[PDB]
Short mmCIF file of C-alpha atoms and ligand atoms in Angstrom, two decimals:
data_model
loop_
_atom_site.label_atom_id
_atom_site.label_comp_id
_atom_site.label_asym_id
_atom_site.label_seq_id
_atom_site.Cartn_x
_atom_site.Cartn_y
_atom_site.Cartn_z
CA UNK A 1 5.74 -38.85 17.27
CA UNK A 2 3.53 -38.89 14.47
CA UNK A 3 1.46 -42.17 15.48
CA UNK A 4 1.46 -40.85 19.06
CA UNK A 5 0.27 -37.25 18.01
CA UNK A 6 -2.74 -37.98 15.73
CA UNK A 7 -5.84 -40.39 15.25
CA UNK A 8 -6.07 -41.58 12.18
CA UNK A 9 -9.22 -41.39 10.42
CA UNK A 10 -10.77 -42.18 6.81
CA UNK A 11 -8.99 -41.45 3.55
CA UNK A 12 -10.41 -38.29 2.00
CA UNK A 13 -8.65 -38.39 -0.96
CA UNK A 14 -5.85 -39.61 -3.25
CA UNK A 15 -4.04 -38.99 -6.62
CA UNK A 16 -1.07 -37.34 -8.17
CA UNK A 17 -1.23 -35.22 -4.96
CA UNK A 18 -0.33 -38.02 -2.72
CA UNK A 19 -2.76 -39.45 0.09
CA UNK A 20 -4.92 -37.41 2.38
CA UNK A 21 -6.50 -38.23 5.50
CA UNK A 22 -8.89 -36.97 8.25
CA UNK A 23 -7.23 -37.00 11.57
CA UNK A 24 -7.40 -35.30 14.90
CA UNK A 25 -4.95 -33.82 17.11
CA UNK A 26 -4.90 -36.29 19.86
CA UNK A 27 -3.61 -33.70 22.29
CA UNK A 28 -6.53 -31.34 22.28
CA UNK A 29 -8.88 -32.86 19.48
CA UNK A 30 -8.04 -30.49 17.03
CA UNK A 31 -9.59 -31.64 13.33
CA UNK A 32 -6.66 -31.88 10.93
CA UNK A 33 -5.82 -33.42 7.52
CA UNK A 34 -3.06 -35.50 7.04
CA UNK A 35 -0.92 -35.73 3.54
CA UNK A 36 1.30 -38.09 2.71
CA UNK A 37 3.77 -37.98 -0.25
CA UNK A 38 6.37 -40.59 -1.91
CA UNK A 39 9.58 -39.06 -2.09
CA UNK A 40 10.35 -40.52 -5.49
CA UNK A 41 6.66 -38.60 -6.48
CA UNK A 42 8.39 -35.24 -5.44
CA UNK A 43 8.93 -32.92 -8.48
CA UNK A 44 10.38 -29.84 -6.51
CA UNK A 45 12.49 -29.74 -3.90
CA UNK A 46 13.38 -27.06 -1.25
CA UNK A 47 15.61 -26.11 1.66
CA UNK A 48 14.74 -24.90 5.16
CA UNK A 49 15.94 -21.58 6.91
CA UNK A 50 18.68 -23.87 8.63
CA UNK A 51 19.17 -25.71 5.35
CA UNK A 52 17.21 -29.33 5.40
CA UNK A 53 16.07 -30.71 2.05
CA UNK A 54 12.06 -30.91 1.94
CA UNK A 55 9.51 -30.83 -0.70
CA UNK A 56 8.64 -27.07 -1.86
CA UNK A 57 5.08 -27.32 -0.58
CA UNK A 58 6.52 -27.40 3.04
CA UNK A 59 8.92 -24.42 1.98
CA UNK A 60 5.48 -22.63 0.96
CA UNK A 61 3.17 -23.02 3.48
CA UNK A 62 5.74 -21.68 6.32
CA UNK A 63 6.20 -18.61 3.83
CA UNK A 64 2.37 -17.83 4.16
CA UNK A 65 1.25 -18.90 7.69
CA UNK A 66 -0.41 -16.05 9.79
CA UNK A 67 -3.50 -14.86 11.13
CA UNK A 68 -5.00 -15.01 7.75
CA UNK A 69 -6.99 -17.84 7.39
CA UNK A 70 -7.42 -17.71 3.38
CA UNK A 71 -4.28 -20.03 2.78
CA UNK A 72 -4.38 -23.73 4.60
CA UNK A 73 -2.63 -23.76 7.43
CA UNK A 74 0.64 -26.05 7.90
CA UNK A 75 0.56 -27.50 11.73
CA UNK A 76 3.75 -30.02 11.19
CA UNK A 77 5.71 -31.88 9.32
CA UNK A 78 7.50 -35.37 9.62
CA UNK A 79 9.96 -37.12 7.39
CA UNK A 80 9.91 -40.72 7.06
CA UNK A 81 12.54 -43.14 4.83
CA UNK A 82 10.58 -42.96 1.75
CA UNK A 83 7.90 -40.57 2.63
CA UNK A 84 6.76 -36.54 4.06
CA UNK A 85 3.91 -36.43 5.91
CA UNK A 86 2.28 -32.99 6.42
CA UNK A 87 -0.06 -32.13 8.91
CA UNK A 88 -2.78 -29.47 7.88
CA UNK A 89 -5.67 -27.40 9.54
CA UNK A 90 -8.81 -29.04 8.87
CA UNK A 91 -12.22 -27.22 8.56
CA UNK A 92 -15.33 -28.87 9.89
CA UNK A 93 -17.94 -29.42 8.33
CA UNK A 94 -16.34 -28.80 4.81
CA UNK A 95 -16.78 -29.16 1.00
CA UNK A 96 -14.42 -29.10 -1.79
CA UNK A 97 -15.60 -26.39 -4.55
CA UNK A 98 -15.54 -28.82 -7.26
CA UNK A 99 -18.07 -31.07 -5.37
CA UNK A 100 -19.97 -27.87 -4.36
CA UNK A 101 -20.68 -27.18 -7.75
CA UNK A 102 -21.11 -30.50 -9.14
CA UNK A 103 -23.88 -30.72 -6.77
CA UNK A 104 -25.76 -27.53 -7.17
CA UNK A 105 -24.54 -26.99 -10.73
CA UNK A 106 -23.45 -23.12 -11.71
CA UNK A 107 -23.59 -20.35 -8.92
CA UNK A 108 -25.76 -17.69 -8.92
CA UNK A 109 -23.63 -14.44 -9.13
CA UNK A 110 -24.00 -13.11 -5.76
CA UNK A 111 -22.33 -16.41 -4.40
CA UNK A 112 -20.01 -16.45 -7.27
CA UNK A 113 -18.44 -13.29 -6.23
CA UNK A 114 -18.18 -13.82 -2.58
CA UNK A 115 -16.23 -17.11 -3.46
CA UNK A 116 -14.10 -15.79 -6.55
CA UNK A 117 -13.21 -12.51 -4.09
CA UNK A 118 -12.02 -14.27 -1.50
CA UNK A 119 -9.76 -16.46 -3.68
CA UNK A 120 -8.33 -13.28 -4.85
CA UNK A 121 -7.07 -12.33 -1.37
CA UNK A 122 -5.91 -15.80 -0.66
CA UNK A 123 -3.65 -15.60 -3.95
CA UNK A 124 -2.65 -11.80 -2.96
CA UNK A 125 -1.63 -13.29 0.31
CA UNK A 126 0.57 -15.99 -1.21
CA UNK A 127 2.06 -13.19 -4.08
CA UNK A 128 2.66 -10.90 -1.14
CA UNK A 129 4.66 -13.76 0.50
CA UNK A 130 6.57 -14.45 -2.15
CA UNK A 131 4.77 -17.56 -3.18
CA UNK A 132 3.38 -18.66 -6.88
CA UNK A 133 0.40 -21.76 -6.23
CA UNK A 134 0.57 -22.48 -10.15
CA UNK A 135 -2.44 -24.73 -9.38
CA UNK A 136 -5.66 -22.30 -8.81
CA UNK A 137 -8.85 -24.55 -9.73
CA UNK A 138 -12.00 -25.64 -7.68
CA UNK A 139 -10.55 -29.13 -6.47
CA UNK A 140 -7.67 -26.65 -4.97
CA UNK A 141 -10.50 -24.77 -2.81
CA UNK A 142 -12.06 -25.74 0.61
CA UNK A 143 -15.41 -24.20 1.75
CA UNK A 144 -16.29 -23.70 5.50
CA UNK A 145 -19.46 -24.39 5.20
CA UNK A 146 -20.63 -22.89 8.73
CA UNK A 147 -18.45 -19.39 8.40
CA UNK A 148 -18.78 -19.29 4.30
CA UNK A 149 -15.06 -18.99 4.40
CA UNK A 150 -12.49 -20.58 1.79
CA UNK A 151 -9.45 -22.07 1.74
CA UNK A 152 -6.85 -22.21 -0.92
CA UNK A 153 -5.32 -25.83 -0.56
CA UNK A 154 -2.38 -28.00 -2.42
CA UNK A 155 0.83 -26.19 -2.89
CA UNK A 156 2.65 -29.28 -4.27
CA UNK A 157 3.16 -27.70 -7.82
CA UNK A 158 3.84 -24.33 -6.17
CA UNK A 159 7.03 -21.97 -6.83
CA UNK A 160 9.06 -19.13 -5.34
CA UNK A 161 7.42 -16.21 -6.96
CA UNK A 162 9.85 -14.54 -9.54
CA UNK A 163 9.93 -11.82 -12.45
CA UNK A 164 11.56 -13.75 -14.63
CA UNK A 165 10.17 -16.53 -17.04
CA UNK A 166 8.95 -19.88 -15.74
CA UNK A 167 9.82 -22.82 -18.29
CA UNK A 168 8.55 -25.68 -15.66
CA UNK A 169 4.95 -26.56 -15.29
CA UNK A 170 3.49 -29.24 -13.60
CA UNK A 171 0.07 -27.86 -12.67
CA UNK A 172 -3.07 -28.88 -14.15
CA UNK A 173 -3.42 -28.29 -17.94
CA UNK A 174 -6.76 -27.26 -18.60
CA UNK A 175 -5.99 -24.19 -16.16
CA UNK A 176 -2.89 -23.34 -17.93
CA UNK A 177 -2.31 -20.44 -20.21
CA UNK A 178 -1.92 -20.44 -23.94
CA UNK A 179 2.02 -19.09 -23.78
CA UNK A 180 2.51 -22.25 -21.80
CA UNK A 181 0.64 -24.59 -24.21
CA UNK A 182 2.43 -23.26 -27.33
CA UNK A 183 5.88 -21.92 -25.99
CA UNK A 184 6.75 -23.93 -22.62
CA UNK A 185 7.00 -20.06 -21.35
CA UNK A 186 5.11 -17.97 -18.74
CA UNK A 187 5.46 -15.53 -15.92
CA UNK A 188 3.69 -16.02 -12.62
CA UNK A 189 0.95 -13.24 -12.26
CA UNK A 190 -0.09 -13.45 -15.71
CA UNK A 191 -0.93 -16.87 -15.81
CA UNK A 192 -2.20 -16.80 -12.33
CA UNK A 193 -4.74 -14.25 -13.92
CA UNK A 194 -5.81 -16.80 -16.61
CA UNK A 195 -6.19 -19.81 -14.10
CA UNK A 196 -8.33 -17.36 -12.46
CA UNK A 197 -10.57 -16.56 -15.41
CA UNK A 198 -10.97 -20.39 -15.68
CA UNK A 199 -12.38 -20.31 -12.31
CA UNK A 200 -14.78 -17.90 -12.53
CA UNK A 201 -16.02 -19.25 -15.75
CA UNK A 202 -16.45 -22.61 -13.88
CA UNK A 203 -18.43 -21.10 -10.93
CA UNK A 204 -20.77 -19.08 -13.16
CA UNK A 205 -21.14 -21.76 -15.98
CA UNK A 206 -21.12 -25.09 -13.90
CA UNK A 207 -17.82 -26.33 -16.08
CA UNK A 208 -14.36 -25.28 -17.52
CA UNK A 209 -14.43 -23.39 -20.94
CA UNK A 210 -12.03 -25.42 -22.67
CA UNK A 211 -11.01 -29.13 -22.66
CA UNK A 212 -8.29 -29.48 -25.30
CA UNK A 213 -5.42 -27.67 -26.34
CA UNK A 214 -6.46 -26.06 -29.43
CA UNK A 215 -9.48 -24.47 -27.59
CA UNK A 216 -7.27 -22.68 -25.08
CA UNK A 217 -5.14 -21.42 -27.96
CA UNK A 218 -7.88 -19.72 -29.59
CA UNK A 219 -9.33 -18.49 -26.39
CA UNK A 220 -12.83 -17.94 -27.60
CA UNK A 221 -15.20 -17.98 -25.07
CA UNK A 222 -18.82 -19.42 -25.33
CA UNK A 223 -21.22 -18.69 -22.41
CA UNK A 224 -23.67 -22.12 -22.19
CA UNK A 225 -25.52 -20.07 -18.85
CA UNK A 226 -27.13 -16.88 -18.52
CA UNK A 227 -23.98 -14.42 -17.31
CA UNK A 228 -24.53 -10.83 -17.32
CA UNK A 229 -22.23 -8.80 -19.21
CA UNK A 230 -20.15 -7.33 -16.49
CA UNK A 231 -19.05 -10.97 -15.52
CA UNK A 232 -18.54 -12.06 -18.98
CA UNK A 233 -16.61 -8.91 -19.53
CA UNK A 234 -14.19 -9.59 -16.45
CA UNK A 235 -14.10 -13.20 -17.45
CA UNK A 236 -12.70 -12.40 -21.20
CA UNK A 237 -10.58 -9.95 -19.71
CA UNK A 238 -8.67 -12.60 -17.25
CA UNK A 239 -8.69 -14.57 -21.05
CA UNK A 240 -6.81 -12.36 -23.02
CA UNK A 241 -4.35 -14.04 -25.18
CA UNK A 242 -1.51 -12.15 -25.08
CA UNK A 243 -0.01 -11.79 -21.34
CA UNK A 244 0.13 -8.21 -21.04
CA UNK A 245 -3.65 -8.00 -21.93
CA UNK A 246 -4.77 -9.60 -18.71
CA UNK A 247 -5.89 -7.21 -15.55
CA UNK A 248 -3.33 -6.72 -12.66
CA UNK A 249 -5.41 -7.91 -9.24
CA UNK A 250 -6.12 -4.74 -8.48
CA UNK A 251 -7.72 -4.18 -11.98
CA UNK A 252 -9.76 -7.55 -10.96
CA UNK A 253 -11.23 -6.41 -7.62
CA UNK A 254 -12.10 -3.00 -8.90
CA UNK A 255 -13.74 -4.22 -11.84
CA UNK A 256 -17.36 -3.47 -12.00
CA UNK A 257 -18.77 -6.85 -11.41
CA UNK A 258 -16.78 -6.87 -8.23
CA UNK A 259 -18.53 -4.28 -6.10
CA UNK A 260 -20.50 -5.01 -2.71
CA UNK A 261 -19.17 -8.33 -2.21
CA UNK A 262 -20.80 -10.08 1.04
CA UNK A 263 -18.86 -11.04 4.07
CA UNK A 264 -18.12 -14.35 4.50
CA UNK A 265 -21.01 -15.09 7.21
CA UNK A 266 -23.37 -13.34 5.15
CA UNK A 267 -22.50 -15.73 2.49
CA UNK A 268 -22.87 -18.52 4.74
CA UNK A 269 -26.22 -17.64 5.99
CA UNK A 270 -27.96 -16.73 2.43
CA UNK A 271 -26.37 -19.52 0.36
CA UNK A 272 -24.86 -22.20 2.26
CA UNK A 273 -27.34 -22.60 5.89
N1 676 B 1 -11.90 -34.91 -3.52
C1 676 B 1 -12.20 -34.32 -2.22
C2 676 B 1 -11.36 -34.43 -1.04
N2 676 B 1 -9.81 -33.63 -1.90
C3 676 B 1 -8.47 -34.19 -1.49
O1 676 B 1 -8.44 -34.84 -1.26
C4 676 B 1 -7.23 -33.21 -2.35
C5 676 B 1 -6.25 -33.31 -1.47
C6 676 B 1 -5.65 -32.46 -2.58
N3 676 B 1 -3.95 -32.15 -2.23
C7 676 B 1 -3.73 -31.48 -0.76
O2 676 B 1 -2.88 -30.83 -0.27
C8 676 B 1 -5.26 -31.68 0.17
C9 676 B 1 -5.48 -31.28 1.41
C10 676 B 1 -6.62 -31.62 1.84
C11 676 B 1 -7.45 -30.82 2.74
C12 676 B 1 -6.59 -30.12 4.18
C13 676 B 1 -7.57 -29.65 4.97
N4 676 B 1 -8.61 -30.14 5.36
C14 676 B 1 -9.41 -31.39 4.28
F1 676 B 1 -10.49 -31.83 5.17
C15 676 B 1 -8.18 -31.76 3.40
C16 676 B 1 -7.08 -31.93 0.59
N5 676 B 1 -6.54 -31.94 -0.44
C17 676 B 1 -11.90 -33.66 0.18
C18 676 B 1 -12.55 -34.59 0.47
C19 676 B 1 -13.26 -33.98 1.79
C20 676 B 1 -12.77 -32.92 2.72
C21 676 B 1 -12.04 -32.07 1.87
C22 676 B 1 -11.30 -32.67 0.35
#
């Protein structure tokens, strides 16, 4: 019933995460994305309410689904002899944040504020649903160019949220915290806040602040573009070497730089159209 239900379009991307194709749901013409992942390549397995062994991404995406549009929606999934296929809602027109930044350079602060705020709302929703993403980065954020809404994608490195230490990690290394680099140990929320600091620097400077393990461990931030004192302060706080020196999500969103965010539609009108 997979090839019956969907018309497959072009390949959108492929890499460590699998292969993702553009698609259309035949029944009603809904734009979709079709993600294929080989069974051998699946690092983390989970189990459904009725106890079926699936990729962790399937478990996690079901835990987050609801009216909220900050996280990509899982529409369906299929098992094959050597692979799983995931059907995801696809915004149209769309561009990932990595490509958007590559083309436009460093983002104006007003725009970064709107985008960052929306990423924070999406991550908070994940956590509230018991889900930890573990790979927050520009490549995992899609921009709905008409409505100015961002969507978090790719939960294939994620895990159930817990309060004890994680000792496994398969997300993106240059967004990973110094405690992972040094000790192979981290806690969920504080590691997430570190990756959010990396992301915010990326938005306002047009590139990530650290390339090497030694730079992550030193944690010394240098600004290559003109960035406001308040934005610099928030970034440096997110990037505190000691996990307990990092702000809570509440503290980030109450920070002075985060006041007076634009609504998504205002953001599209001013910055995207
Ligand atoms: N290099 C850009 C490419 N990114 C990926 O394929 C990343 C891939 C990583 N892992 C995923 O789970 C995943 C889902 C999607 C996706 C999801 C929903 N709509 C889309 F258009 C794309 C895309 N991803 C992309 C091209 C065109 C539109 C969107 C994205």
